[PDB]
Structure formats: structure tokens, C-alpha cells
A paper describes a structure:
As the exact epitope and mechanism are crucial elements for antibody drugs, we report the crystal structures of checkpoint molecules in complex with the Fab fragments of therapeutic antibodies approved by the FDA or currently undergoing clinical trials, and reveal the binding modes of the complexes and the conformational changes induced by the antibody binding, thereby providing a structural basis of checkpoint blockade by monoclonal antibodies for the treatment of cancer. In summary, the elucidation of the crystal structures of the checkpoint molecules PD-1, PD-L1 and CTLA-4 in complex with the Fab fragments of therapeutic antibodies sheds light on the molecular mechanisms underlying the therapeutic activity of these monoclonal antibodies. Blockade of the ligand-receptor interaction of these immune checkpoint molecules can directly enhance the function of T-cells, which represents a critical paradigm shift whereby checkpoint blockade aims at disinhibition of the activity of T-cells compared with the previous immuno-oncology concept, whereby cancer vaccines and cytokine therapies aimed at de novo activation of immune responses. Monoclonal antibodies blocking immune checkpoints have demonstrated unprecedented therapeutic benefits in clinical trials and provided a major breakthrough in oncology.
The FDA approved nivolumab for the treatment of melanoma in December 2014, NSCLC in March 2015, renal cell carcinoma in November 2015, and Hodgkin lymphoma in May 2016. The PD-1/nivolumab Fab complex and free nivolumab Fab fragment were crystallized and their structures were determined and refined to a resolution of 3.3 and 1.9 Å, respectively. The structural comparisons of the Fv regions of pembrolizumab and nivolumab before and after binding to PD-1 show little deviation in the conformation of the CDRs and minor adjustments in the side chains involved in the interaction with PD-1, implying that these antibody drugs maintain the CDR loops in productive binding conformations prior to interaction with PD-1.
Author numbering:
A (entry chain H): 2 to 209
B (entry chain L): 1 to 211
The structure:
């Protein structure tokens, strides 16, 4: 059972956007479907529902006359067609079956401001000769807009000991964060460590 | 619409403790009330439906009770992995409505930070700015004091902090402090130090580097 969403991205206010949710492993034609959204740092809010056969739809007041929920049962796909977007509409949008299988979410960011890709800088200790058996490495991801950036290490082969900090908003109006990882000092010189930085809004991918 | 009020807003308990979360509806929703768990960076997950039925694959320590306007979600013995925000949702009528959530935080024992300091790199300094980073790793509680010293001169207004969410396995936090200065000011000085005080330390810990 899988619900896979797509369609999210950065969009300027006033514009339209269509979100898709494709289902696998369920009798989709027999399931009611919902959209639910969640602003950053906030709670869950129901957006709309559509009956299994498409014959009935209901909406949250704040999207009536503006959003349309629909489905293509022959493609096992649920749609949300949005119009006249505002900052208010910035959220992760989830699809959910009526019996509560949920998709992974897709982020919609509504912003007039120009997007900017990050500068990426290594964080390494000042030598190689640590004072202990554990070392920390990292990358500074600096001056980007808008959120988010995602970071992996060694293409996701390195996960244990990884901490990626919540972004901080600068006086610049831009964002900065860092990602760090702790590793054995003995591996310094043996093992290559690469951070994989991804900032989809500016089509930027960097690997220091 | 049917208003759902959850309490308390935040609940902070040790692993093994019993946790009791409340949801109150402004009018009867009969038993059309579900509970969800949402861990950091994840979609919500159904725990309990129809007030008291455990969903598929949900551990036995989760249970629910109530009908009409008063509802309870119980975690009979809390685990570190239960760090999450918990929501109730009514499906008695339209629009569907959610409570505002209860954040369940894990009260573990005191753990001192491992501290690391990073000089500004190569490239960054080509642009006219210097960022020196102090890392405090895997500690508890969240409160920590970080002081920057350049030549034993305490710094102010030139640093920003960021703190992770509680770790799902060990319930600790990590924190970064970034001192940001102009490249040309990062050479009027030699000694850069981060000094840390925390409940887990018996004495302040200082990490430093020269030039």
C-alpha cells in the first residue's frame, strides 16, 4: 500500500498549481480520498474530500471557489487543482484515504521573493590529529532562499551520527544551516566524507 | 464547526511512564474520533480509530477511550521513539477538524555535551566573511550556555544558535553556535574559543584554536 505525491514546489502568489497523489496496492476506485495540509511549524488542517466514484466533494471554507479536488480512477490518481495562491497556502499537502493511509506529503511554498542557491563550505577540525577517538565533520550551507535544503552524507550510506540543524533566518533575509556528523578519528584519512546538499527551489546540488 | 481542544499542550515524561492525553470536543462526536502520531519530518500515522480501536501495526501500549465530548489517548509505557506530536480528529461531520496537537517530549537523564570547534574554511574567506562554528553534541537537558571568546574578550550580538529536535533513539539534543565576523576582522585576532556550561558538566568546557 503506497500513496505517492508530487507537484509541489515554489510558486509565486496569485498563480495556480496542481498536486498529484498516485495510489498503489489498494482498491482505489472504492476509497474516499482527502487532502490535508500543514503550514510549517503548525497543525493539521483538512482541505477537501472526494467520494470513491467522484460523485460528491466537500471543501474547507477557505478554499471553496478556489481549489478543486478530482480523481482519475483509471490512473489511480487523486488531484488537487489550486488557484490564486497566497502566503497563507504555504504548507505540506498530504493525501489520505478515508481509512487513513497517508502519503509522504509534498511541499508548496508561496513566495514573491527571488530564489537563491546556497554557498556550501566544509566544516573540518584544524588538522587531522584530533585530541580524541571521535571527530566531527560538517558543512555550512549558507545564504539561500527559500527553505528547505536537504543534506545527506555519502549519498545516504552514512546516516548514524548525522545531525542536520534547523535553518536560521539571517539579517540578510536569507537562510543558513549546517549539517554535521561524528566519525571515528581513525577513519580520517581512510574514508572519504562527502555532504550532498540539495536546494530544489534554485535547482542547486553541491557535494563538499 | 466542531472545535477540538487538546490538553496539555506539552507533556514531558520519562521512558516507562504512563502518558495520558486529552481531547475535548465542543459538541458530541459520538465515537467518531481518531488519534494520530506525527514524528519529526514524517506524515501523521493513525493510532486509534472510532475512539478506542487500535489501528493496524500499532503497538499494544497505545489505547484510547471516550465517547461524546471527552476522549483520552493513553501510552501505557512510554518509549523514546514516542517523541512526537499527537493529534485527534473528528469525523462526525464536515469540515473534518483536528485538535491543535499535544507535543510529547521525553524526559531522559542528564547527559553532557561533546564539544567541537570549527575554524572558517578555505573558500568562505574568499567572500568577505568568516564563520566559526561551535558544536555541542548529544546532550540533555536542552538548556546550555555557550560563550565565545576572542583573545579572552567575550563576544555579543555576533552569534546565532540552532538546536535539533530530540533524538528518537536516545532523546538527546545537539546544538550549533555560529560566530559570524568579517574576514578582515578574523585576522585582527589569533585565539578563538567556545566555552560551554551545562547541567551535565562539573566544570566549564572550552574548545579553542589559534589563527
Amino acid at each position: 500500500v503506497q500513496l505517492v505525491e508530487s507537484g509541489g514546489g515554489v510558486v509565486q502568489p496569485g498563480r495556480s498549481l496542481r498536486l498529484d497523489c498516485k495510489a498503489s496496492g489498494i482498491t482505489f476506485s472504492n476509497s474516499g480520498m482527502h487532502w490535508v495540509r500543514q503550514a510549517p511549524g503548525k497543525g493539521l488542517e483538512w482541505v477537501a474530500v472526494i467520494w470513491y466514484d467522484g460523485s460528491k466533494r466537500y471543501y474547507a471554507d477557505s478554499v471553496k471557489g478556489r481549489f478543486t479536488i478530482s480523481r482519475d480512477n483509471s490512473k489511480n490518481t487523486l488531484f488537487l487543482q489550486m488557484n490564486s495562491l497566497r502566503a497563507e497556502d504555504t504548507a505540506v499537502y498530504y493525501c489520505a484515504t478515508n481509512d487513513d493511509y497517508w502519503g509522504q506529503g509534498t511541499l508548496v511554498t508561496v513566495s514573491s521573493a527571488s530564489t537563491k542557491g546556497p554557498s556550501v563550505f566544509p566544516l573540518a577540525p584544524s588538522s587531522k590529529s584530533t585530541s580524541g577517538g571521535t571527530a566531527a565533520l560538517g558543512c555550512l550551507v549558507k545564504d539561500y532562499f527559500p527553505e528547505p535544503v536537504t543534506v545527506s552524507w555519502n549519498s545516504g550510506a552514512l546516516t548514524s551520527g548525522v545531525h542536520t540543524f534547523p535553518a536560521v533566518l539571517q539579517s540578510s533575509g536569507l537562510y543558513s544551516l549546517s549539517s554535521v556528523v561524528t566519525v571515528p578519528s581513525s577513519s580520517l584519512g581512510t574514508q572519504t566524507y562527502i555532504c550532498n546538499v540539495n536546494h530544489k527551489p534554485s535547482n542547486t546540488k553541491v557535494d563538499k | 464547526e466542531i472545535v477540538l481542544t487538546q490538553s496539555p499542550a506539552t507533556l514531558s515524561l520519562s521512558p516507562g511512564e504512563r502518558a495520558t492525553l486529552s481531547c475535548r470536543a465542543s459538541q458530541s462526536v459520538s465515537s467518531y474520533l481518531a488519534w494520530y502520531q506525527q514524528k519529526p519530518g514524517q506524515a501523521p500515522r493513525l493510532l486509534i480509530y472510532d475512539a478506542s480501536n487500535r489501528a493496524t501495526g500499532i503497538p499494544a501500549r497505545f489505547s484510547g477511550s471516550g465517547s461524546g465530548t471527552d476522549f483520552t489517548l493513553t501510552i501505557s509505557s512510554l518509549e523514546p521513539e514516542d517523541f512526537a506530536v499527537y493529534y485527534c480528529q473528528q469525523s462526525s461531520n464536515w469540515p473534518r477538524t483536528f485538535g491543535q496537537g499535544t507535543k510529547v517530549e521525553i524526559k531522559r537523564t542528564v547527559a553532557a555535551p561533546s564539544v567541537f570547534i570549527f575554524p572558517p574554511s578555505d573558500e568562505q574567506l574568499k567572500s568577505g566573511t568568516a564563520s566559526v562554528v561551535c558544536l555541542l553534541n548529544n546532550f540533555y537537558p536542552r538548556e546550555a550556555k555557550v560563550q565565545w571568546k576572542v583573545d579572552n574578550a567575550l563576544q555579543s550580538g555576533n552569534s546565532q544558535e540552532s538546536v535539533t529536535e530530540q533524538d528518537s533513539k536516545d532523546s538527546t539534543y545537539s546544538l550549533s553556535s555560529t560566530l559570524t565576523l568579517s574576514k578582515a576582522d578574523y585576522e585582527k585576532h589569533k585565539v578563538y574559543a567556545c566555552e560551554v556550561t551545562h547541567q551535565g558538566l562539573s566544570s566549564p568546557v572550552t574548545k579553542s584554536f589559534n589563527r
